[model samples]
Target: QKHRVAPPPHVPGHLIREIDAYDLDGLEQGFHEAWKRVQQPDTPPLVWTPFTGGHWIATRGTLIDEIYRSPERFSSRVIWVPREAGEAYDMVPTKLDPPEHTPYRKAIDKGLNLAEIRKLEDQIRTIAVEIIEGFADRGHCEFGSEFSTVFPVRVFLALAGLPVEDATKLGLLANEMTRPSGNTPEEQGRSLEAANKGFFEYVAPIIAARRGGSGTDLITRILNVEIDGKPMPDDRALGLVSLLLLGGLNTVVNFLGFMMIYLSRHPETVAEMRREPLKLQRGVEELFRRFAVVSDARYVVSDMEFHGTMLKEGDLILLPTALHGLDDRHHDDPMTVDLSRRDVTHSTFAQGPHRCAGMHLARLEVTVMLQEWLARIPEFRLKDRAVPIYHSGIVAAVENIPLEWEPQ
Candidate 1:
């Protein structure tokens, strides 16, 4: 009396599994832990799961690295996990492959380079302290909802020359776009479109003003950038800027919540970090590995056998770089947090040409948050058995994190 759908003809029999990568129940346990359940000894590196329209999911660290490096085989054209989202997903550099993706990526990369970010270092530090000070004296604050989300949005707005007050408005939109809280795929898809429109509308005027000029802001520089010996067109420019907006708004905001949640629970780690502030940089890198929070998909370019699995053009491949850090094959006791761990390795920002454009900015933001917060606030702990709610879609995120400490 059951009707089980047959696997796609192209799907190898051995690669099919009953795993729902986006299941909210699994995410409730913790994002990385949910993923750990997916990789068993018998599970193939790549499998055609019957979730999200039956797509391929890659879990092995080496295989994920290989897919990112070989964009020729795994195209960036359709990067959403759910096939429905792919229909609407459009962000430059990330959506394009190879030579076509180069100029757009470089334009944004140049804007986010070390020298440019260095100029914003003092400003970033100032913002971090200001945010921590606001909640620090209270002895308790919902870390994720109150400070973590607001801090990065403010920094992003300031760097992009947008109004800082709009962080709340824009942050909500960005969060919905990347990690929608909706119940249905249709609802989440609409949320993503709304965010795309909201971001475009907000940046349109600024882009127009800098049509033929340049400025210190990322948008102005991107607007004035030339690709293929010509000024980047309005649509292409919008695409590039939209990607930056999404990147600037989401990645660090969500990542900070996970970092603080871990540190708040592990006072030993926090105490050691506070005792030796000199180890902050290495500590940050180690945290990046442990708290890695993003996963993106790539499209199969053409029909071909990949890593012993049958593939077809347009099949979505889930490249979860978050799994790289959790891989026991790469790191000894991958789950344990060791701030002094040497040669920390993770694809949290990803690998290859599509690596996160805002990596340096993200690193600085994370480091400043840890360094400044630990310096000012006394040893803190999760308030009263507080359980942070988590969500994992295209991006892994923490919804709420309540923390408390002895009032100074």
Candidate 2:
């Protein structure tokens, strides 16, 4: 308690509400409800919290967008929470600002380009079928681990050139890096550092093997990438591969979990999508909007007044993309997931140069899963109204979801 950063005088006493994005009251209920709790009528768009090393929580969607798009004022040098953890995050592109961030981003983008990701629809659907069929005969199954987790884990395994057996251990460490269990930032930082070290060590052998060899997987493509007519810096190459492992394992894996829960509870919504298959695309977009799962941060570059509050240099602001999708001010009836909304708007993939590079692959995976899963198991709902255990931090996710459906 004594070590927590006291709210500076620039912060109004009322605006200094105790808000911990990492630990939300409504998270166990649902990711959207967790952020919706922040968007209450009395809460301001932005608040300076003493938690997570005294960073600002952008509760409103528009404010979050403005802060995200303007990297000059809000640098992505340390996207992780807690100044110490972000300092130790030390990954490529995300840890570097633009111009300097451009080439590395380009290299990472090459491995998961929009056009190439589109081409993977067939392969993605095939895997979705294979995974879904594994449990189609069972009347009930833990959807989160059985389907959601393995589907993306296997996809990432093949894509990143990692062994399928390693996915379990990689996922545990990835979860720790994202939402380390601790009461203080120092403690959390320790957990994150240890977890991150595991990833670095795990990827070390693969990075070396790909260095002097030729292959066609994500890691090889990124390592072989040439920027400015020269090969990528060795350290940056290592960081890039490490970062990709986190990127692949974290976001989409959780997304599939929440989506299954949502679909299970709302069969009418499923019925509509099944009848009008083209609506599946829009339905998936709407779901993405409602379940925006990432909660990353940016360091304040200089002392500047932002949205009626004074922000200090070196201060970090927690940007929960979940707030944007659930903010009523940001959308009409934002909490409701209307699959037919002609234009579903969100900043889930984020904005500016640091936009999520794997977004194309993520969207494709979701679309394909819906197409394949719904066709095989047209109707599925939670078994015993089971509440999925929730974890919130860099990524918002449900731990397990037990779902039930009739056998084909």
Candidate 3:
């Protein structure tokens, strides 16, 4: 007999019958609807429709927490369900279930420590400023494709010790992996595979050259750090480069892109932020919370039942970072962007042992970019937003957020 657990309290009117209804607008509208239902009075038990696969959607904070905590029961693998069921790709760390995920994660955390990251901040700032410099004065440019996409790719390449000339190519490749636009996941997977191969081949020599030198950069440091008491194999070291490249390329890029969108509209917030650079940290955290740009996938290692809802073993779960934060039980104002709201509950960076490995560095990069952009152009706003469209895949974003602002 299956032991059924009672669902955490939920209001009555919020019964969402079809999850695939979300796919109608690429899930953007679905996210908004979920937020609204949670806000409505007398909401019903949340019934999320099946999109990629038939799965449960944990709409409240406690339920989300329950799923995350029982990774043993509700795993993270097979996280992607297709808009078409058969058209989805898998992410490495996203698919790994515990005890095993621990080591690969350790390699990343230990490899990109804060001490070493501090040395890279100036370089990161320079990259951010340079990207902003292109459109800072004119205040009219494509936010996503231009600065947002390119800057992170450049940083990822520079940090990985790869040639900067290949930034565009690398980015094109990274794009294929996260959000392929083709008819099937296989086609997108092909593009992603090609990208991964090119990236791996591109960084192979850099890894070889750095192994000879004893330096403090991530690659050099990882070369020295023992994995399983032996020097990290060439494949693993190369894999690290691939991992960070994918991460730095998408996470911060999407984040910075979203930050620009938020800042452009909120003149008062921008004004306050520009005058006080210290606020950029809070601003970044707030903006990230508001945007919830990245949604992570997980795999279930064992079978589990909750509130009469039966989840079989080896099932996959999709944790929408944005939606989970929107859960009422987690925060006071889950939907609104509160610049002054202290102690936010959003988790763009997952918690526990798998929290973002390069979060500190990413934070520093974002803060510096915000300070520099705002200081240079305090009065920025979108020039032509008549036709705004969003792109989706693993990392979703506003495809072309063009902005224009008059200078002070």
Candidate 4:
């Protein structure tokens, strides 16, 4: 009954399936993780999993979307599973529920709204062109470590006014927080802690210098925001910058690698997009649907019967953004990537008030990436028999994609 307590007595026996959403073992090889989960049996719209310290999982797009949209029933406070891991996420707005969530959200938006992102597009492309040109002459390259990591990181560093040299160091720490190497729960939490601590340590002195000063940089602008008509505390400011690093360093970084894998297998898609050019952005929208990679959890706010099940207070619901677009009910041939597909929608960046603030930045990044890459290295694919490694944590990633193309 020790572990049974994880499910709480209200959870039905059949409903209590033991699947660790964090664990990626036993997946069907070569398929995106979203597809693998859809293929797994007994996954209802909502199912209880004892793994990750016992939680509920939302398997359908509508269920996950609704849960995320309805913040009253689901809180973002305990977003990460195993309870302990999520509790460490003390940042406001991201973890802060509505009402209190709005101002910080607005402030962050001031730094990264569509208009702001548009202003940076030129510089972003300049960075992209430079990184691409650095490796274009070579016939082949490891797409993951070399290009994917470098491009967005440099852009993020320059955007936030951080030292670009710190990208490598900060990248590793953020990865650990997102996908820890530790096998056990306690060990994984410590790994998360180390990254969390490392991030504050990095931001402390940098932010300290900005205190009581005026600067035009994005970080300075965001930190200058008033919380409740007064200054935001140091820890909160550090948390904000850390959130940016986590987003800037990894979200687009791993996504680039995964999207490359798709592009490699289906060069036809690339050729078509290259031909139309205007169609490239449409292709990226579909790519966003086809390559949805992240899965997040929501903390059940109180005891309630949700979707015909008794959901207890503090019960965790793992919402795989991966499952949203891939759900067959909302999509026909859900696994296929159709650029021309109508109604391309997903919770990949999440839904509702907590919808990802960095989404516009992400769209700009991917569009620019595709546009630049196709212009320079028009024909590319995985090098002979190179296997891309994958892991299914909160974020799903494909790594070590050694890519090759004919260089003129």
Best by lDDT: 2
Tens-digit lDDT track for model 2 on 179-296? 8867788888888888878878887788878875688888888888888989787678767888888888778988888777778888998999899998887677788887788989
Which 10 consecutive positions of candidate 1 have the poorest summed lDDT? 1-10
Ranking of candidates on TM-score, top first: 2, 4, 1, 3
Model 4 clash tally, residue pairs: 0
Q: Comparing 1 and 4 by lDDT, which wins?
A: 4
- Global Cα RMSD, each model: 2.4, 1.6, 5.8, 2.2
* Best of the two (2, 3) by lDDT: 2
For each candidate, what is the lDDT? 0.79, 0.82, 0.61, 0.80
User: What lDDT does model 4 reach?
Assistant: 0.80
Q: Report the error of model 1 at residue 11, Å.
A: 1.5
Task: For each of the candidates, give the backbone clash count.
Answer: 0, 0, 20, 0
Q: Please identify which of the two predictions, 1 or 2, would achieve the higher lDDT against the true structure.
A: 2
Location of the lowest summed lDDT over 10 successive residues in candidate 2:
1-10
Ranking the candidates on lDDT from highest down gives 2, 4, 1, 3
Considering TM-score, which of the candidate structures 1 and 2 is the better prediction for this target? 2
- lDDT tens digits, residues 247-323, model 1? 89878888888888878888888888888887776788888888887777888888988887778898888877777
Model 3 spans with C-alpha error above 4 angstroms: 1-17, 20-48, 82-95, 181-216
Residue 226: error of model 3 in Å?
Answer: 1.3
